[PDB]
């Protein structure tokens, strides 16, 4: 699925993210903008032979098991596939692991780039939530 902007606040909003860890909804609004045009089906193949998956983008080094990567630790206990649902609910479960690891948002390049350091209200703008 390919989400609209304040869809994805809103579904966002419902699983619990705002403000999650000290990070404003905007914060994941804009992640999932540049992390994966909001389209749960993105996928990226890196370097060390992992992929991203999702609209989060979530890497198969550490978070979930694709059964194609070595090294893996799947500290999210989830396939990845789970992670290319429609719903979104798989991801935020595991992005909410990731930012307690104790490195926060800095776990997604797109967010560190292109987010950090910008009104990231801005992206729930105009939005009903
Ligand atoms: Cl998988
Ligand atoms: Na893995």
Not at 48 to 70: A, E, F
Not at 103 to 125: E, F, L, P, S, Y
Request: glycine share 10%; aromatic share 10%; net charge positive.
């Amino acid at each position: 699925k390919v989400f609209g902007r304040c869809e994805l606040a809103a579904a966002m909003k419902r699983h619990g993210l705002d403000n999650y860890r000290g990070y404003s909804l905007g914060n994941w609004v804009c992640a999932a903008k540049f992390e994966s045009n909001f389209n749960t089906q993105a996928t990226n193949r890196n370097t060390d032979g992992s992929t991203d998956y999702g609209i989060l983008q979530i890497n198969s080094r550490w978070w979930c098991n694709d059964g194609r990567t070595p090294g893996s630790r799947n500290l999210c206990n989830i396939p990845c596939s789970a992670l290319l649902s429609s719903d979104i609910t798989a991801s935020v479960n595991c992005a909410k692991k990731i930012v307690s690891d104790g490195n926060g948002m800095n776990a997604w390049v797109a967010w560190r780039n292109r987010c950090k350091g910008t009104d990231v209200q801005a992206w729930i703008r105009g939005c009903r939530l």
